[PDB]
Design an enzyme around this catalytic site. Structure first.
Site, mmCIF file in Angstrom:
data_model
loop_
_atom_site.group_PDB
_atom_site.id
_atom_site.type_symbol
_atom_site.label_atom_id
_atom_site.label_comp_id
_atom_site.label_asym_id
_atom_site.label_seq_id
_atom_site.Cartn_x
_atom_site.Cartn_y
_atom_site.Cartn_z
ATOM 1 N N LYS A 1 0.783 -1.254 0.000
ATOM 2 C CA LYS A 1 0.000 0.000 0.000
ATOM 3 C C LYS A 1 0.814 1.304 0.000
ATOM 4 O O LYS A 1 0.220 2.387 -0.045
ATOM 5 C CB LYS A 1 -1.026 0.034 1.149
ATOM 6 C CG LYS A 1 -1.958 -1.175 1.228
ATOM 7 C CD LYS A 1 -3.251 -0.968 0.478
ATOM 8 C CE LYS A 1 -4.402 -1.675 1.188
ATOM 9 N NZ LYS A 1 -4.526 -3.098 0.800
ATOM 10 N N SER B 1 -8.523 -0.513 7.514
ATOM 11 C CA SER B 1 -8.375 -1.552 8.549
ATOM 12 C C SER B 1 -6.940 -1.560 9.122
ATOM 13 O O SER B 1 -6.681 -2.105 10.204
ATOM 14 C CB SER B 1 -8.752 -2.925 7.985
ATOM 15 O OG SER B 1 -8.298 -3.052 6.648
HETATM 16 C C1 LIG Z 1 -5.358 -4.038 0.845
HETATM 17 C C2 LIG Z 1 -4.763 -5.431 0.931
HETATM 18 C C3 LIG Z 1 -5.097 -6.447 0.023
HETATM 19 C C4 LIG Z 1 -6.093 -6.302 -1.116
HETATM 20 O O1 LIG Z 1 -6.004 -5.090 -1.860
HETATM 21 P P1 LIG Z 1 -7.347 -4.540 -2.583
HETATM 22 O O2 LIG Z 1 -6.915 -3.411 -3.484
HETATM 23 O O3 LIG Z 1 -8.089 -4.022 -1.369
HETATM 24 O O4 LIG Z 1 -7.811 -5.771 -3.305
HETATM 25 C C5 LIG Z 1 -4.497 -7.700 0.162
HETATM 26 N N1 LIG Z 1 -3.630 -7.940 1.156
HETATM 27 C C6 LIG Z 1 -3.292 -6.997 2.043
HETATM 28 C C7 LIG Z 1 -2.302 -7.310 3.126
HETATM 29 C C8 LIG Z 1 -3.838 -5.734 1.943
HETATM 30 O O5 LIG Z 1 -3.467 -4.802 2.860
#
Ligand SMILES: *Cc1c(COP(=O)(O)O)cnc(C)c1O
Ligand SMILES: *Cc1c(COP(=O)(O)O)cnc(C)c1O
Ligand SMILES: [Mn+2]
Ligand SMILES: [Mn+2]
Lengths: 312, 322
Positions: free
Chosen positions: A53, A72
């Site tokens: 992210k 989250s």
């Molecule tokens: C956000 C996230 C995902 C999935 O990403 P999306 O764009 O919400 O599909 C998968 N694994 C982790 C650890 C994440 O933080």
């Protein structure tokens, strides 16, 4: 045209390839042996901030009184990171049942924490309640198209790192990552399957494919995969509809089994959300995927896990 | 008689012997850990090794050395004493080669290691947590099984196998300045020293050891083998063994310095790897990092910049903490 362009992905790469790790692909012989495929793990748990992210969050920040969002844990950490770097104060809406370590980590990253209820709705609203209160701007975890562009740059790296790659198994929540990856992957090679992986307790992405139309969770999901509770949205759905090859849903016990296998056998400290991809590859339903598909790269997306889980 | 119990030729031969069955493990880095340490650190990831530690190199080299050109004279059984990690590696090695394994394990050895040994199919036999009891119990099991002892760290073929770690690091880190290696019985740091001093002796070899089990340190000060008086008690459960007769002379001549570290220092360095690198090391593998972060390592010249730390194991109980 989809909400983001191929071009937006490379500009995101060049926009974040200076503060973003080209994380390794690790492999495992004991794990290759339980799958019966040749698994390649894209280790995004090693990324700045603890998950992939940071890409979308950096790219959103580069490419304000405040910046606000709902998380989250992960996006709320990678946003507060990328914004502290530019002197911008940050407000993070985080469900009250959300991981305690992802809470403490957001405050320690500088930002003000405001608790909401666990849902796409309570979140998506206690978020605009702070926006009005602070005049800050919102950066959206998976629908904001700068953020979706940040995550496709996982897919570029994987194509080099695994030259002879057969399939990318990706965990899906809001679908920002798996869509952002499909925008990038499917151009350059379409014999490369894109499989989505998702808990059964939160199977809006499977239901949508079954139904042929956007079919979100209408009850808040109860699932150990704290990071994929979000529903897929309007920007990311079309891509998932056209470019994702299949969706594989996994039970709570499959996710727990596969996350423990990565801890115990690979010694990688993944959060349980990152064990969903592997769970999907070890599933009864995956044992009927064409034996041609051998070179499966699984995205381990994060390692932001509380060193005291239900130890289940 | 100038010769140590192994040479570098034994290490190159070990590499050939085992390379087809052991992982060529990565060397990972962490910019935040480099910052805290003020050096460039390179983590040789032997926790990703088969059975969860480097011990598979020595155990597989020794096994392979015991098997003749025909089936005739092949061992009936192999026997060892172990705190867990050599037990695991020997069981797995013996299994690949169709040989029965009997492992003598101290009762107070970690449960996850005992479970792992059983999962690989060994018979476990329990002893007191002392060097002396591990040896006498293993000698009883030898006389009963007609088996062959593969010692955790004094057997030349085991020492030779652990040294292949140094062969790989030298390739992986071209301008390596130092290796840091936890030391218990010294099989691993002896095989590394031999390999590092033969090929590139400008690279430092440093032992890292708990101060609660500082027989390597005290033996080096006195210039003679000086084991722990009492069984050592430490959270670094893999390095409670004392050095022995085969590894002592090599450590004596080829190991540059020994850094001792407190329990708290080991705990802290271990947590730092779990949290900052997301690597599931066992506390014994945080000993090398503890040493580099210690006050005393501060006198290592600033020229010793590129430091390779062997993360030697990942065999820790997940439910167990503090
Ligand atoms: C956000 C996230 C995902 C999935 O990403 P999306 O764009 O919400 O599909 C998968 N694994 C982790 C650890 C994440 O933080
Ligand atoms: C056995 C072991 C050591 C020490 O090796 P010696 O050859 O006995 O010095 C260090 N770390 C781990 C994880 C071990 O299992
Ligand atoms: Mn879903
Ligand atoms: Mn010692």
């Amino acid at each position: 045209q989809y909400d983001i362009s191929f071009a937006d992905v490379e500009k995101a790469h060049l926009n974040i390839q200076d503060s973003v790790h080209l994380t390794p692909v690790l492999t495992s012989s004991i794990l290759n042996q339980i799958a019966g495929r040749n698994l390649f793990f894209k280790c995004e748990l090693f990324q700045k901030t603890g998950s992939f992210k940071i890409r979308g969050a950096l790219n959103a920040i580069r490419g304000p009184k405040a910046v606000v969002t709902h998380s989250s844990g992960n996006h709320g950490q990678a946003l507060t990171y990328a914004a502290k770097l530019e002197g911008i104060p940050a407000y993070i809406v985080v469900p009250q049942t959300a991981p305690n370590c992802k809470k403490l980590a957001i405050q320690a990253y500088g930002a003000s924490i405001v608790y909401s209820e666990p849902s796409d709705e309570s979140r998506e609203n206690v978020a605009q309640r702070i926006i009005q209160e602070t005049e800050g701007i919102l950066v959206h975890p998976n629908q904001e198209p700068a953020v979706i562009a940040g995550q496709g740059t996982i897919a570029l790296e994987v194509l080099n790192q695994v030259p002879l790659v057969d399939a990318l198994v990706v965990p899906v929540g809001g679908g920002g990552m798996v869509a952002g990856i499909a925008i990038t992957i499917k151009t350059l090679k379409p014999s490369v399957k894109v499989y989505a992986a998702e808990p059964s307790n939160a199977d809006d992405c499977y239901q949508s494919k079954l139904k042929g139309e956007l079919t979100p969770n209408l009850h808040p999901p109860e699932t150990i995969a704290d990071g994929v509770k979000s529903s897929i949205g309007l920007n990311t759905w079309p891509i998932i509809r056209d470019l994702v090859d299949d969706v594989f849903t996994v039970t709570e016990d499959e996710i727990k089994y596969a996350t423990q296998l990565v801890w115990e056998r690979m010694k990688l400290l993944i959060e349980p959300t990152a064990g969903v991809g592997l769970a999907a590859v070890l599933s009864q339903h995956f044992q009927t995927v064409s034996p041609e598909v051998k070179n499966i790269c699984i995205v381990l997306s994060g390692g932001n896990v509380d060193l005291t889980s239900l130890s289940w």
